[PDB]
Ligand binder design. Structure first.
Ligand SMILES: [Zn+2]
Length: 255
């Protein structure tokens, strides 16, 4: 009975569960502990794709590397581009920043696009997808207000992270994300120092790393500038509670 849908990353399963509930059965391509930017789908996964009725793309080029392989594995599945209508930020002007799933504001748009496409695929349950969408959009506004309350009073708006997956989140809440990685690469020995000074000159209290990437340089920086080390997980499946934990971590660090 349920529609088989595959999504790219764990957070999307959260969005799909909220929008589809029991009407969909979700599979996920990228493991929560892998760097999605260098992930290559496994043969057993491409085979399983033949069962899929639809595939939900983050879009903005996020899936560019696997796109041809997904289409060849299943030519009948609908590709849902969840980034439709969204104006992206650029990562050094080469391309769009694809981390739109960490902005509650932009997720409202992704959710609307997804529900609209699912209702086209499964017209008989259109009313349920619409009601489920409405429930999820209201939850998103409430989450947005909650995150804004946690972050608006910070005098320190800057935070250092290893991998820059938080540019949209940061724009939403007026934070400044200072990344350690450069062009998907570990910092130079010089850059590391420069980054260390930057961090010293701003009195930063904590350095964040991400589970999917080595925290080696975040740890070295923290040891050198007198800070602690915390993990932020941009791929957490428990999306809403993870975002609140992220905001609290940032608030605790600038406090
Ligand atoms: Zn990323």
């Amino acid at each position: 009975d349920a529609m088989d849908i595959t999504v790219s990353i764990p957070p999307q399963q959260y969005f799909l569960e909220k929008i589809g509930g029991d009407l969909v059965r979700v599979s996920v391509l990228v493991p929560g502990n892998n760097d999605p930017h260098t992930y290559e789908p496994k043969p057993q996964q491409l085979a399983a794709l033949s069962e899929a009725e639809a595939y939900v793309l983050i879009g903005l080029g996020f899936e560019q590397p696997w796109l041809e392989k997904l289409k060849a594995a299943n030519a009948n599945m609908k590709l849902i581009d969840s980034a439709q209508g969204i104006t992206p930020l650029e990562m050094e002007k080469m391309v769009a920043d694809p981390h739109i799933w960490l902005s509650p504001t932009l997720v409202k748009r992704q959710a609307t696009t997804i529900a609209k496409e699912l209702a086209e695929l499964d017209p008989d349950n259109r009313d349920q997808y619409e009601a489920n969408l409405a429930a999820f959009l209201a939850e998103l506004e409430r989450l947005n207000q909650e995150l804004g309350q946690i972050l608006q009073p910070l005098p320190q708006r800057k935070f250092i992270v290893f991998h820059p997956s938080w540019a949209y989140f940061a724009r939403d809440y007026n934070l400044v994300q200072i990344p350690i990685e450069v062009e998907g690469q570990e910092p130079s020995a010089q850059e590391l120092k420069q980054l260390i000074d930057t961090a010293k000159e701003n009195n930063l209290t904590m350095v964040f790393g991400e589970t999917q990437f080595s925290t080696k340089s975040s740890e070295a920086i923290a040891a050198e500038i007198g800070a602690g080390v915390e993990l932020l997980d941009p791929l957490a499946a428990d999306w809403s509670s993870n975002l609140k934990a992220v905001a609290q971590k940032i608030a605790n660090a600038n406090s």
